[PDB]
C-alpha cells in the first residue's frame, strides 16, 4: 500500500495578498482592522483626566482660578491627560479686564498642559525695592472677600506712590524664581480711567507708556484714556475703570525687563508648573465613564484590534492607530481532519487517514508569535515634549499638523509592508512543515522503502488503524511486520 | 547515460551587491536610476497649474487683482498646482500704497496657495455701525473706472465723518464670516498726507495712533506726517497723499479688535479661500507644454524610472524621488539556451540539452512582481497640509527645510536597504528553483535510478531527442524503455 | 560503522530573543550596547572645533569681537563644530549699550553657527546719500585705539548733521550686499542722554521715534529720556549717555526700511556668513584633548560600539545613537572540537571525530557581514540644515525638540526590529548549513549507502583516522575500501 503525509484541503473563505504569489485563497483569516463607535468622554483607565482646574471650587470659572481671585483658592489636583473644552474662557468675579486686547485670554489653557501646578509663596518683585519708596497695595472697592471686606486680586497689585506728578520713567528687572526644572508664569498690567480720575489719583491726564522686554519679544502699550467698550465679565456694576493685562513666561537662567510711567499695576504671586502632559480638544467629562483611549473625533473608545479605519484625529491613551485600507492575516492553510497535518494510507484496504497534533500546534504557535510581534508596533512612546497651544498663530499650528501628518503616513505604509511580509512568511512555513514531516516519515520505515519521490512511499504489507497510530505515536518497527530493520554499525 | 537538470551558464556583464555574498557577477541587470534633463514649465498631465490669478484680465497685475481694483474684476479659475514666479509683485492701477512699510507686499502669494478662491458678497463691518452716524465712502480722483468716473478701491473704503476735531479713539470688533472650512482674509489701512491738508479734511495736524489685535499678535501704527518717498507703483501723477495698509486672516470661531483715531481707512469686501494645494518656485508657463511632474530645479520632467540621482529640490506631481547612489537589480542568473532552466543528457551519444519554459517563466514573473512592489514605494501621499509661504521669517523657513531634509534622508536609506534585501532574496530563490526541479525529475524515473546525489542520475539505456522532449513534456514511463515501473499499492 | 555530520554541542552562556522561537540559549554572543563615561571637552578627531571667536585676540570678549571694537580685530579661524559656553556674553571695551533692552544680546551666538565668517570691506549705506548732506561720524572720547587716540566703533557710526532743530522724519532703504549664498548681518542704534544734553547736541528735549521694517517684522522705538540703569559693561567711567541697539539679517534678493528722526546712530560695516555647522552646549575647551564625538551630556566620548544606553542628548561627530534596552547577537551555534561543523564515526572502533574548517569559516564570514550591515545604520548624514539658536522663543524650541524626539524614537524601534530579524536569520542559516553538508557527504559514498535518513549513513567496513581525513579532504573512493564505485554513463 501507499503511505504518505501532508495537509488537509478545505473550502476557502478568505483571500489574502502577498508580494510574489498575488492573491491566495485560504480557509480562515484574522481581521486586524475595525471601525470605532462614538462614545462620551470620561476618565482614562490608567489615571485621572483634568477638565476643570478646581473641581471643588464652586462659583469660580477657569479664569478666576487662574487669576487667584478671592473665594477661588481651592486645591488643584494632578492628572495624566487634559481636555480643552473652552476656546474662549470667561471670568465673573472681579474688576473688569479688557482681555481680548492683549494676549492674556488663553491663560487657563496654558496652565492646563502641566501635571504639577503650584502657586508661589513669595512675591515676584519685592515691594520695598521700588524707586518711590512709600508704596502700598490699594484694596479695591469691588473685589470683596468671602466675608465682604474689600480685597485685592492676589496676583496683581494696584500700586500708589508718595509722589503725584509727571515722571520720566522707571525700570525694573525680573529674574527666575522657581526651581531648575520648573516653568514660571507671571502677569502684570496697567490702569485706565477717565481724564478727571487720573488727575485726582495719579496727577496726569495724558495716556502713558509701558514697555516690556522678555525672552519672547517686545511689547509697547499706550492705552487709550477715554471712551470704553461695554461693561462685562465682572461682578461689579457702574465701573468707570478698566485694566490692561499682559502675561509672561520664564525658564531657568532667564531674565526680563519692564519700563513704566505713572499708572502701573505691579506683579504679585506667580505660577510654577512642571511635568508636561498631552491635551485633547473635546467636551466636558461625564460621570462614571472609563474608556481605554480618548479620540478627538469619536470620544471614549476601546482597543479591540491594533488597527482601525475611519476618520483621522488626535488621541491620548492606549488606542489603535490610523490605517488606510482593510487588512487580513492568514489563520490556516492553503485551500483548493481535526488538525491540518496528517497521514494517509491508501490501498485495497480502502483509504484511512490520521492526524498529528504536535506538528499542527507549532504552526499555530508561530502564527500567534508573529501576530504579537506585529501588535507590538503600536507602542512607540517614552518621549513627551512640552507641546504648544491651539490658538497662537497659523504658521506654528500648520507646522505641528505637518509633523503629525508625516508621522501618520509613514507608520501606515510601514504597517502595510509588514502585513504583506508576514503573509508570505506563513505561506512558505506551511510548505517547510510539510517537507519536514517527510524526513520523519522515512526515518523508521527501513531500507525496504519504495518511496514515490513526491512524499509518498510504497511498502509490501497492509496497514490498519494500529499502523497509523503506531507511526503517529513514533513507536513503529518494520521488523514487527516482517521486513529487515537495518544493518548494525558493529561489523 | 547521465541525465540531470540545472541552469544555463552565460557571460557576466554586471555586478550587484548583497548583504552576505558581497559582489556577484550576473548576466543581466535592470537600472533603477537616471539623471533628468531640464525642460520648460507647463501644465501637469493631471490638471491645471496656476501662474496668474486672472489669465483673462488684461492690463492688471496680481496686486491689482488681489486688491479688487476696478477694471481688474475677472474670474479666478481653479487649479491643482501653483508657481510663485514673482517674489516682489507690483501694482499700477490706483492710488499709491507704501507696500514695503508693513506686511501687505506678499498678498498674491498668500492667495495663490488655495484651490478655491471666492470674493465676498457682503461687507466685513456694517457701514451704519460706526460711532459717527453720517459716514460715506469718498470716491477718489485717481482710481477711475472703465468709463472714467471716479471710484473707490472695492476692498478698502476711504472713510469720512460728520465731526471734525480731536478724538480720543474708537474701537470695533471683527468676527468670522466665511463658512466653517474657509479662511477669511481682509485688509485695512490709514491715510497720510501733509499737515495743511489733514487740518482741512480731518481737522488734525499731528500723527495719529492705530492699534490692531488679532490671533497673530499686536500691531501699532503712528504713521509719519511729512516727507514722503518717491511716487511709484501707481497710475496717478502729482499726488501728495499715501496710504498705509495691513492685512489680517481669520478662521472659524475667531475675532479681532481695531482701535483707531481720526484718519482711518476702513475694511470692505474680503476673500474666502479653501482647499490648500502645493506651490513651487519657478518661471511663467510656456504655451502647450505638458509634463509628468514639476521640479523646482529642472522644470518639466517625465518619470521613466522610479528613482533618480542628481540635485535635490522640491517637486509637485508624479515624479521620482531622491536617491544617493546608483542602484541595479538582478534580471537573470549567476554567471561564471532559449531559456535558463533546462535538462541535459550526456553519454556516448555526445551531449544533448533541452529547455523548460514553465519553470523559467515563474522566476521572471516573481522578479516582475518584486519590481512592482518596490516601485510602489514612491506613492506615499493622501495627506496635504496648509503649508507656509517663502518670505516670512528665517526660523520658520529653516524648520520647514529641516523637516524636508530629514524626510528625504530617511527615504533614501530605506530604498537602499530594500534594494539589497531584494537582490539577496532573488539570488536565493534561483537556488530554490533548481532544487525543486530535482524532485520533479526523480518522480517519473522509477526505482532503478542511481542518482549521483548532486542533481544527476544514472540510467541503463541511451537517450535521444525523444527522451529529452518526453521528460520535459512530462509523460515518460521507464516501462516503454524496459525497466520496472513501480510496485502496485495493492498486494 | 555509522558515519554522519553535524554541529558540536557546548555549554550555553547567553540568551537571545527571536520572533518565533522566543528565548534561545547560545554558547557565545556579541554585545552591541555600552555605557559611556564622561570626559573633558576637546577637539574632534576630524577637525577643529570653535569655542572662542578670536582665540588669538587678547583682552577681548566675544561681544567686543562681534561689535568690531578697536583693538579686537584679529583673524577668525575656521571650524567644523562649535560650543556655546556662554548663554549671556558680556562686553568690556567701549561705550555702554543697554543690551538687555532689545535683542542684540545673543550676537556672538548668532555668528557662532557658520563656518565662514568675513567682515565687509564696504559700508551698508553710503555716507554721502543722507537727507542732510554735511554729515560726519563723531569720534568718541571713550572708545580709544591702542595708542590712545579717540576712535569710533567700526560697525556703528555716531551721526551728526548740519541742521539743529525739529525734523518730521527721514526714510532709508537697505538692500542685499553679500554674495548669492551669503547671510548678511547688520546693526544700528539710537542715542539716549539727559534732556539738557540733547538740546546742546541735537536741539530737542523730547524722546524721538524710530521705526524698522525688515523681512522679520516691525520694531518701533521711543527710548526714555531721563533716569538710567546703573553704569556697567564698559571701559569708561562717569558717562551720562546710553546707546540702544538692534540687529537685522538679510538673504539674497531682500530689502528693508528704516525711518528715523533726530538722534539716530547709523549702520556701518556688516558681516557676511556662510556654511552652517552644528553647535553643542557645554564648557570651554581643554588643551590637548581629542575625542571621537562630542555629547552634550557626557563630554568627549569614543565609539567602541555602534549603540549606547543611558541619558539622551545632542551630539556631533562620529558617535553611537540612543537605544532603549541592551541587545545581544548570536556569535556561535545553538546550545544543548576545533570548529563546530564536523563529522563523526561510531562503531566497534570506539568513536572518532573530525572538524571541517572551510564550512565553519563561511558562517563566521556571514555573521560578520551581517554585523557590518547593521553597523552601517548609524551613518545617515549628508544633509545639514541652517538650524536655529537656543534662546529665541518657547514655541520654536519646543518644535525643534519634538522633531528630534520623533526621530530618535523611530530610529530606536527600527534598530530593535532589525536585531530580532538578524538573530532569527542566523539561527535558521545554521540549520541550512548542517543540511547542506549532507548532500556533499552522500556524493562520494557510492550506491551501496544505507542512509539513516537523519543525516547518518551505514557502510560495510571500518573507518579510521585515515577514513576521516579522506572524507574531509574529499578524495575518497569506495573501491579502495572494497565497494562498487558506480555505474558508468557509457554503455
Ligand atoms: C474586517 O474589518 C473591516 C473593518 O471593520 C471590515 O470592513 C471587513 O468587512 C472585515 N472583514 C472580515 C473578514 O472580518
Ligand atoms: C484563528 O486564530 C486563533 C488565534 O491563534 C486560533 O485560536 C484559531 O484556532 C484560529 N482558527 C482556526 C480555525 O484554527
Ligand atoms: C544606470 O543609471 C545611472 C544613472 O546616472 C548611470 O550613471 C549608470 O551608468 C547606469 N548603469 C547602467 C548599467 O545602465
Ligand atoms: C529583464 O527584465 C525585463 C522586465 O522584467 C524582462 O522582460 C526581460 O526578459 C529581462 N531580461 C532578460 C534577458 O530576460
Ligand atoms: C552588555 O552591555 C550592557 C551595557 O552596559 C551591559 O549592561 C550588559 O551587562 C552587557 N552584557 C554582556 C553579556 O556583555
Ligand atoms: C565572535 O565574533 C568574532 C567576530 O564577529 C569572531 O572573530 C569570534 O571568533 C567569535 N567568537 C567565537 C567564540 O567564535
Short mmCIF file of C-alpha atoms and ligand atoms in Angstrom, two decimals, chain B residues 27-30 330-332 340 364 367-368 371, ligand 4:
data_model
loop_
_atom_site.label_atom_id
_atom_site.label_comp_id
_atom_site.label_asym_id
_atom_site.label_seq_id
_atom_site.Cartn_x
_atom_site.Cartn_y
_atom_site.Cartn_z
CA UNK B 27 24.46 38.25 -16.93
CA UNK B 28 21.69 40.87 -16.97
CA UNK B 29 20.53 43.68 -14.71
CA UNK B 30 17.90 46.42 -14.60
CA UNK B 330 19.24 41.29 -10.81
CA UNK B 331 17.41 40.34 -14.02
CA UNK B 332 18.93 36.92 -14.68
CA UNK B 340 17.81 29.23 -18.45
CA UNK B 364 10.62 36.19 -14.34
CA UNK B 367 11.07 39.27 -10.50
CA UNK B 368 8.42 41.47 -12.11
CA UNK B 371 9.95 45.16 -9.08
C1 LIG D 4 14.82 41.97 -17.91
O1 LIG D 4 13.62 42.34 -17.23
C2 LIG D 4 12.50 42.54 -18.11
C3 LIG D 4 11.37 43.08 -17.27
O2 LIG D 4 11.11 42.26 -16.14
C4 LIG D 4 12.17 41.22 -18.79
O3 LIG D 4 11.07 41.41 -19.68
C5 LIG D 4 13.38 40.71 -19.56
O4 LIG D 4 13.10 39.43 -20.10
C6 LIG D 4 14.61 40.63 -18.64
N1 LIG D 4 15.79 40.27 -19.41
C7 LIG D 4 16.02 39.04 -19.89
C8 LIG D 4 17.29 38.86 -20.66
O5 LIG D 4 15.23 38.12 -19.72
#
